[PDB]
Design a protein around this ligand. Structure first.
Ligand SMILES: NC(=O)C1=CN([C@@H]2O[C@H](COP(=O)(O)OP(=O)(O)OC[C@H]3O[C@@H](n4cnc5c(N)ncnc54)[C@H](OP(=O)(O)O)[C@@H]3O)[C@@H](O)[C@H]2O)C=CC1
Ligand SMILES: CCCCCCCCCCCC(=O)OC[C@H](COP(=O)(O)OCC[N+](C)(C)C)OC(=O)CCCCCCCCCCC
Lengths: 78, 368
């Protein structure tokens, strides 16, 4: 629980000593929080790019498999 | 400094008094003179008062800050330094300071304004009042210290008031009043070098482009000593400046290497050494802190002066008219920024920048 007590102390001293390094680090931190909160989808699309290029089953890959089974099963009944 | 600041042991003031000197010039000696240094608790007054009191000249130091005046007493022997509580809005206290003095030195002047005093009150109203009070008290010599770019028709409220103050001093005290125009002065705790030695200087891309001819504060204090003790300098205007011209951008970058802040490729940029800002923001921030901050910050008028460079009045007299050679900032820059060098402390080996090394560093700074 000690980070809750120390965080105000470390953050202000971080801005005092290195205001530009702190603003850049804090600015990038807020930007990703805006991406998650406002559903910009920038971090998700990067994740979807990494999985596609590294051979992982993507979200679209798993949904394509379902659609292939769905069309296969329907014809099996019709 | 020297050992005896006078050319003789007898000096007849222009008011008619004859003042004899006793002793060889130590602390126990006397010169026979009584001087009043207005603004003696300031940056330049401590230099001037120390030089007068060390040779036995009785100095009257009118003060408004009781703590700042205490260190001045150490400069002279018993009875040499005297203090008068005063205010420029009080006339009785101003007369009491000059009642016995044969020399009056006026160092009162601000580049800012506050809730109580404007730049017109101090640079004109105080200078005029002190000059007139000096004349009614029979003071033989008056010395008024204006700025380097004094001009009655200037766009800067500081340069304008300094220029007008030169006029009003002569119009009250008479044609014999002496005027000094120092350049930016560098010394320990120098206001000129302090802004260059500060790390988080906001808007330096605008402020630090002004070019000047900085002059050693010890020489300016030495020159004033020469002027007061030589009556041939009455009615004269002196421009005290260094031989070399520097821009605050050059000195700012030269200082950075001496402080070794550039030892890390990231630290100066991370620590706020460079803080570029649009001039309208520099105007608004200076304007806002003028009615919010209680301490004198970089104000609006100093922002205007950042564009105006120092112009040497060619009709005025120089150090050579006083028989003195100006000092070179290259030979003194290191020792005055030496306190600010980060690690130093005989870690492995000090980098003592000689006069030759400082000039070599200046070229490297100017190399893109
Ligand atoms: N680089 C420089 O320093 C330059 C200096 N000058 C001029 O040289 C003179 C010496 O200034 P400096 O010593 O360098 O630095 P300061 O800013 O300390 O000079 C101001 C002096 O005058 C006093 N002063 C200012 N306003 C008032 C006031 N309303 N009432 C009473 N006293 C007042 C101050 O008293 P207190 O100490 O109690 O506050 C102080 O002693 C100044 O007039 C300045 O304009 C011009 C060009 C270059
Ligand atoms: C928290 C309150 C701090 C406010 C400071 C302040 O108001 O001070 C700021 C001003 C200026 O006056 P100064 O400090 O002498 O100006 C010199 C400093 N400059 C050059 C930065 C302007 O003061 C006033 O307007 C006077 C009324 C203040 C009364 C106290 C409230």
């Amino acid at each position: 629980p000690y980070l809750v007590a120390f965080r105000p102390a470390v953050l202000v001293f971080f801005f005092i000593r290195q205001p530009i390094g702190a603003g850049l680090l804090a600015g990038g931190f807020l930007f990703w929080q805006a991406d998650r909160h406002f559903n910009f989808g920038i971090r998700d699309n990067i994740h979807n790019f990494k999985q596609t290029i590294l051979g992982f089953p993507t979200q679209a890959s798993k949904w394509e498999t379902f659609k292939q089974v769905d069309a296969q099963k329907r014809a099996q009944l019709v | 400094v020297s050992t005896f600041p006078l050319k003789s042991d007898i000096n007849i003031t222009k008011s008619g008094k004859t003042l004899l000197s006793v002793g060889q010039g130590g602390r126990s000696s006397r010169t026979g003179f009584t001087a009043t240094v207005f603004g003696g608790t300031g940056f330049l007054g401590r230099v001037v008062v120390s030089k007068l009191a060390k040779h036995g000249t009785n100095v009257v130091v009118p003060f408004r800050n009781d703590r700042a005046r205490r260190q001045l007493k150490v400069n002279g022997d018993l009875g040499v330094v005297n203090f008068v509580e005063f205010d420029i809005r009080n006339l009785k206290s101003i007369e009491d300071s000059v009642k016995y003095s044969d020399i009056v030195i006026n160092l009162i002047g601000t580049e800012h304004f506050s809730k109580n005093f404007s730049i017109e009150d101090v640079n004109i109203g105080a200078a005029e009042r002190i000059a007139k009070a000096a004349k009614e008290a029979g003071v033989s010599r008056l010395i008024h210290v204006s700025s380097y770019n004094a001009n009655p028709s200037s766009s800067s409220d500081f340069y304008a008031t300094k220029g007008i103050g030169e006029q009003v001093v002569r119009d009250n005290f008479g044609p014999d009043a002496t005027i000094v125009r120092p350049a930016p002065m560098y010394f320990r705790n120098s206001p000129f070098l302090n802004e260059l030695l500060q790390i988080k200087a906001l808007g330096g891309n605008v402020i630090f482009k002004k070019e000047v001819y900085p002059v050693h504060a010890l020489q300016v204090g030495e020159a004033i000593e020469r002027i007061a003790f030589d009556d041939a300098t009455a009615g004269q205007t002196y421009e005290l400046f260094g031989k070399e011209r520097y821009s605050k951008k050059e000195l700012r970058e030269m200082i950075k290497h001496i402080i070794h802040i550039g030892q890390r490729g990231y630290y100066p940029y991370s620590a706020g050494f460079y803080l570029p800002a649009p001039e309208p923001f520099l105007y608004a921030f200076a304007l806002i802190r003028q009615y919010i901050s209680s301490q004198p910050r970089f104000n609006v008028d100093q922002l205007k002066r950042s564009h105006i460079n120092q112009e040497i009045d060619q009709s005025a007299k120089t150090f050579t008219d006083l028989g003195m050679v100006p000092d070179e900032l290259s030979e003194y820059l290191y020792r005055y920024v030496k306190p600010h060098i980060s690690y130093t402390s005989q870690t492995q080996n000090r980098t003592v920048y000689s006069k030759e090394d400082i000039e070599k560093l200046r070229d490297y700074v100017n190399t893109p």
